């Protein structure tokens, strides 16, 4: 495409900073240095990996405001939401600095008299695929535990957010992050195929699109290494007729409008049962026309320009084929005139499964409405999609809204609120949203090499 | 393929046994749709009900228990004695799981506070299973007992020398009332996996065999998008330092090496042994080697049977003749056996160094590669100089010692002073070109679940 | 989407969706390609050229229709439109004059005339193709592939199923039997299907090298053969001696037709030290004087760019050169409005580390590079991963003949508009793929080359 | 395997071992390649087919130890190792007198001699070979493709680099410049490697579906063209007319030279009713006939076929036939003792669904199909993933001409014996691959074919 990796500020459209693809010997350096840190990495006590974490959210909040600006200028997002990713990264070190150690214990056997036990062993370095829509978030959701677990890190980041890679390095440098121990290069695709082919990385991790994951995916199971893959999401958002109309109307905007739609699990596909339907749209459509749309530095806009220029091209030409297809447009449905890269507000109805709105991953401010007969038309609504990353259901009836959990064929189920990763808990999908769980000790043990150790077994 | 059929040959007769058509692209759709519907009724079972299933299928397994063994050993060439501990341990295995597997499936508490958010382990669907011909009866229960305790139906391509035991498995499942679908086979060639793996009704792929297999098929189901487990080769250490119980480190040596013929992932394939000690363990391996009786498998006292495939005894006689060539001692063995089976004689390589091809490549046939260590250091390197990383033993008195290269031992099971094995209580699986992903225990069971995040009132 | 999806790009506005063919419309596509074959192969090789004589009169019967939906579809000037169309009918005339002698079989030097080489038919030869021609793409390669005896089995860019649907309607006008052409509207994964289909024999590609390469993988995995027919960054040598003025006016046809989006473009200006700075003025002045506007207005020379997304790649590749260094001379922006128009743009003081230089610029952007002397030039004009096309103006054809044998690419032009043609080889080397079209080369691409030999004792 | 292993066949005892290239000796052999091209493109073809002359010159005073090497690694009885180098060396002349007017640029129909078609070297080709023929199927391409002006770089079975070794000693003698002429003991991940080298240009593979396919995949995926010369399973069609004396006589020479190893060999048999058993007495007559042992001692007909894997193969295969259905009227075994032979075997009642009919038989296993009529005859020919060559005994000359017509394969020998010849093209069709070696189409399969045209206004 370019023989740059190149930062384009997506409100003024300008040229911010061009940087020339990793050449052999850089990707050379960057495998030797990840190896020649996980060497010693691998031998530090938990107690020290998890100083280090500490002292990584300390110069990450030490740096706080220069780290949100970046992530704004780069890749379009509020202010007010790139201050909260960084806030929300910090906390993600210390929360593992305080649990993750005691996930690291060996565990008991039903072999008799503790002779056997399960040992959570370091695996290596471990490359890293990253997307651009939370350019800090994304990747330490899997570095923070990767390293925790004794691995090296080795960031390949998204090529219009380069300036924060460049930054995040700098911060975790300043930390005290051993060398190599957490790395980052600007390789090309050929550069990341090299990589996964060399036997210094011991596995992969992939947050991005469905293509990326599967041509990621196919050269790590050629090459014998463990991926997990957190790819994209079309989540559906079930509204039935006995639901709290007005906080399950906040959810929805809230779950489809954060970070101007660019979430993996946005709530995209609002699937809303036929006598609350109308009264839910006329709200939904009200509440979203409401939100404020401009530069991205000024703290109270509620949505930025789209990251991409291409992407905003894509996104309108799946809204052009929804409303040939039959959807009604009931706002927005336009690039907005001008420089920057914005996309208005959208709200599609009358979506039939058939759609394009209803059958791809929408990444961008654009809302389907599907009616719902009933409880059960709403449920096979949900699962008809080749993604599974997170739902919400909206309902009073307690008892019903468990069961369609245990029915939804997806990761993640928000029950009456607003879904979210959270370190606490497990993030990540099924079906093409991918496979691999991020988070809690999921995170942490999907990197490690699982050993017995069993003496005396005679 | 070699052939429009999947053969089957007696290996110590060298006689056909038996051909079966590649399934067509009807009994493939066929496979699959079964499997969906199966899975789509199992997966709103409880977990009672599928552990008691469990028990059905232990108890068929024991009613046939001698017919099952009679058919691993004639279609493969497995000892008898051997082939009937296999069943013994596969029936084993579904009991085991009925117990322990259900709290397995319990939903987690988690930090979030008041009990708002639990983790949940549901179904994730129908497996594609792709196993190999060593123990026809226990890789294929390995994994599968586990994947229909979590809800998932098991679709099995089982190795083309062993279709009659895939018979004679899916008679005995069907015996104990494993519902249709929820537990299948079909005998597809190479192009109906592929066909398989792009379907939307596999949810995920395990496999069990070479590296090569593992290569082809882990690169199509993550270009598909779905979760594999890999199980493949070993060349697994075994690690004799000069203060070793040497009597109990030689009988561990000779059972781990010679176990199945040789034919073994986990088996003890590279022994690396302290210079001080290297002489009085080689003297007692080679002749306790030698002591082995091959012949017939159907003969009980019988310790060594022919090799399964008359190719890979072929590629195992040029492993051994390359290593020669390289300059490996030839203590014992190195030869094909005369005759209308697939023997091939006991053999002990010795002066075996990094560079050599019985180093190098996974040697799956009863040939024992020796090397000597000077200390335990150069013994921990010599180890991990291997691409494979399956399973490794070590023998020492020294307690701490043993217990800080459990730790670099880069493979994902150590033994001290035992014999390696694989079992239910414990995970199994490698790095490296070994594979990833873990079976056994609580690991084989949550490989193949969804996991979910169920969180209400988050506001 | 779940549609191929038709836009206008003058006006931004919706055309019409289609969905993607479903399995039994691909098994549809494929078993009347194949029955289609099955009774075409066994024709007079001069009723085959009676029929392309005929598929040439349909498409002149309705060559305004057809010019139209091309400009209307992807917004090539009107004009252009009208000149794709008299040349793909002239090729069709051109091939029933020529080509039949092109498959007599060939004499060998075996004794007693005992061994022949006949040119067979091969099967159904499958062609994915790109929207920049959407009528000449398609006719370069059936024409020669349906007289040889083939099936042509088409799959059309998504952006111009308009234009797939009426070539099917006129080509069915024309007499063609069912199947022996056909199209069909397939995603990514139906072509796999296809590419894997033992009714497939072969399949041709014309497009990008990120197509040519996913395609070309499958079919060498699938034991068939390609011609793939890929991007290229032409080199356009000038020098010293050069005719300046005619040089100029090459060099700007040879950038700005089709509104840049041509593989062989003349792309990366070489200019020697003397000349440069007459040219580059020049050159500037009369890509400044290039009308640009609705391509329904005959005289427009610059239409809008076709795809909304490339106008938005091809910019960042001028950012990514002004950014590296390039000299911004003329254009450079996105034209405001609803349309997808882009200014005729030029750099200059571009060196062969840059984007302008090491990528394939899609659209009305030359780049100018100064070469130290003749060696310099062809040293620049070879260090590229393309390989198309080139040309090279200088008063000294000694040079220019020493210099065209040198040059890494499948086609050079002396002192001329480089341009493909029906009686000569096009194609080209490195990433700009491998196979030639055209010419005896085309028809005998997909033949099936049979040794015939009687009596061999 | 860490080593490419040689073992001679007849004894079962190691004759060498050779570690694979390391990432050092890879490097070497593509930059010794591409400098050996960067002169070599420079050279005139006279220069080039002297070369030639000198190659044969330099093989034909080492003969006989080419042929003991032969045979020595593979089995092949002697008699026909040496008729492998007389061949090879017959090919070097014939292509130093024919070759060069191949090379002339072209006349073209534009106007007043202003566009040739040039005929330029492409570059380093990588070849990937099979033990087969270990002489001839390295020159079959090495000499059109050097006299064309290319490199050629060699990876050879690992069962032969004794062969391989020796060939390139002879090159050396004969004067063949460094890098124009060259090998390495590539393993696979060597082999992408070089694949994936800017510095290969193109690739040429003789080999299994398998390889081809392996192959196949990575050019496309390079953007390098390949040609694919693969398996076979000719069909050997005898009607009821037939000169039978004679057809049986082809018939065993086509199926058991060297010891069955032939991708064109004859391994269907396709029989008309009325002459089956006729045909089938005396075809397993003759083959009972044949002797077979020691491969250095002259009267041997047949060897020990060259690989103990493939051998257990074949007999896999046999065995699934015999279970099928086959009848089994000679052979069908393993020969007892160290060397690696397997009985001259016939298996006759053999309809299309076996394995006898569907897979290709590397080894002296013929397979006999009783058709009912010439229609049901040419079905049964083209009922096959194959289609390399195929030979049909008639004596009526005009169906023999219509069923070549209807053939899907690359070469039909009509009342004789199959063979690769220099004069006439050889490559099949379906999944015996693409592309054509020999005559004028081995020599321009790797050229970059490139029109020069000048005064284009
Ligand atoms: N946790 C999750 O499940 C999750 C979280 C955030 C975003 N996402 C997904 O990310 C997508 C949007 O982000 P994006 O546009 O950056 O995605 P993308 O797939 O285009 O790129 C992601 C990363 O992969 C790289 N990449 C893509 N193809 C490659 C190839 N063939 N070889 C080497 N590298 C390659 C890119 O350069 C980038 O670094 C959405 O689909 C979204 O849902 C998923
Ligand atoms: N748990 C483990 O780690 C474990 C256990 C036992 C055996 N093994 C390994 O198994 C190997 C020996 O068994 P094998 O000879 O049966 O192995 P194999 O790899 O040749 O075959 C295993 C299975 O994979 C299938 N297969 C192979 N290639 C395929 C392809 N390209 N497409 C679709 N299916 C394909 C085969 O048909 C068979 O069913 C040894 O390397 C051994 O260590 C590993
Ligand atoms: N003769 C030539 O050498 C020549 C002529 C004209 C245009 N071109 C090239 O065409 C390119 C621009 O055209 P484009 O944007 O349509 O090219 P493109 O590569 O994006 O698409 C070309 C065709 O390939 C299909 N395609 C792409 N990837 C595919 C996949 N993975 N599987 C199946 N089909 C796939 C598209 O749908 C389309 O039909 C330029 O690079 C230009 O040089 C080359
Ligand atoms: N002209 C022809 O059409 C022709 C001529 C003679 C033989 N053959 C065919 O050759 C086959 C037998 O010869 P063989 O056993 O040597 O075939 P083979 O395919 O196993 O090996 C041929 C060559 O390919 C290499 N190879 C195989 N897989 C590879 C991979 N994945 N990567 C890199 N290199 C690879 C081998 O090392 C060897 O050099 C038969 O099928 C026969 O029909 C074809």
Redesign the pocket.
């Known amino acids: 495409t370019a023989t740059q990796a190149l930062s384009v500020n997506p409100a003024t459209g300008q040229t911010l900073a061009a940087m020339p693809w990793a050449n052999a010997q850089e990707i050379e350096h960057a495998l030797s240095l990840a190896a020649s840190g996980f060497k010693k990495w691998k031998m530090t006590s938990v107690a020290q990996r998890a100083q280090t974490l500490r002292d990584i959210g300390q110069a990450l909040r030490a740096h706080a405001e220069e780290m949100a600006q970046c992530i704004t200028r780069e890749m379009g997002k509020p202010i007010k939401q790139a201050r909260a990713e960084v806030t929300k990264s910090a906390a993600l070190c210390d929360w593992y600095a305080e649990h993750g150690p005691a996930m690291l214990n060996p565990e008991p056997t039903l072999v008799e008299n503790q002779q056997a036990v399960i040992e959570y062993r370091p695996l290596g370095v471990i490359l890293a695929?990253?997307?651009?829509?939370?350019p800090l978030w994304?990747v330490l959701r899997g570095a923070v535990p990767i390293l925790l677990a004794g691995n090296s890190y080795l960031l390949?980041?998204?090529?219009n957010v380069t300036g924060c890679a460049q930054m995040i390095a700098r911060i975790l440098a300043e930390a005290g992050t051993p060398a190599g121990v957490y790395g980052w290069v600007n390789a090309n695709?050929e550069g990341?195929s090299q990589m996964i082919n060399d036997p210094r990385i011991a596995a992969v991790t992939?947050?991005?699109?469905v293509?990326?994951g599967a041509?990621?995916g196919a050269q790590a199971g050629a090459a014998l290494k463990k991926c997990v893959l957190?790819?994209?999401?079309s989540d559906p958002f079930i509204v039935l007729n006995d639901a709290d109309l007005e906080l399950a109307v906040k959810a929805a905007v809230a779950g489809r409008y954060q970070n101007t739609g660019q979430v993996?699990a946005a709530a995209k596909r609002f699937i809303v049962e036929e006598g609350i339907a109308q009264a839910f749209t006329d709200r939904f459509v009200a509440a979203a026309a409401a939100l404020k749309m401009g530069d991205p530095l000024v703290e109270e806009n509620d949505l930025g320009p789209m990251a991409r220029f291409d992407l905003r091209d894509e996104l309108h030409q799946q809204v052009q084929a929804s409303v040939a297809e039959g959807a009604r447009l009931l706002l927005g449905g336009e690039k907005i005139a001008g420089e920057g890269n914005y996309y208005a507000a959208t709200v599609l109805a009358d979506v039939t499964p058939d759609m394009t709105a209803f059958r791809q991953?929408l990444?961008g401010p654009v809302a389907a409405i599907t009616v719902a007969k009933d409880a059960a038309h709403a449920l096979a609504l949900a699962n008809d999609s080749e993604f599974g990353?997170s739902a919400t259901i909206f309902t009073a009836d307690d008892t019903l809204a468990a069961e369609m959990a245990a029915r939804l064929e997806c990761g993640g189920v928000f029950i009456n609120g607003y879904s979210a990763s959270d370190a606490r808990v497990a993030?990540?999908?099924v079906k093409k949203?991918?496979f691999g769980r991020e988070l809690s000790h999921f995170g942490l043990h999907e990197f490690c090499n699982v050993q017995t150790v069993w003496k005396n077994r005679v």
């Open positions: 695929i990253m997307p651009w829509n939370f994304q390949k980041h998204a090529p695709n990341v992939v947050t991005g699109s293509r990326a041509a990621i957190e790819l994209g999401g993996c991953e990444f990353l993030f990540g999908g949203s991918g």
